[PDB]
Structure 1
Amino acid sequence: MKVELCSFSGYKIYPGHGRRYARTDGKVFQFLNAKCESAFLSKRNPRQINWTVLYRRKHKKGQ
Structure 2
Amino acid sequence: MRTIECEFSHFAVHPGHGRRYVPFAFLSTKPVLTFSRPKCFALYMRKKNPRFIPWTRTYRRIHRK
TM-score class normalised by the smaller sequence: 0.7 to 0.9
Gaps of 5+ in 1: none
Tell me the C-alpha RMSD between the 2 structures. Answer: 1.1
* Structure richer in strand, relative to its length: 1
Instruction: State the number of aligned residues.
Output: 61
Which residue number corresponds to residue 58 of structure 1? 62
- For residues 16-61 of structure 1, what are the alpha-carbon distances to aligned partners after superposition, in whole Å with 9 as ceiling and x for unaligned? 11100101122221101101010011101110100000001110x2
Identity, in percent, stands at: 43
Q: Which residue of 1 aligns with 2:12?
A: 12
Q: Using the TM superposition, name which of 30-39 and 17-26 deviates more.
A: 17-26
Q: Any stretches of 5+ residues in structure 2 without a counterpart?
A: none
What's the TM-score, normalizing by structure 2?
Answer: 0.85
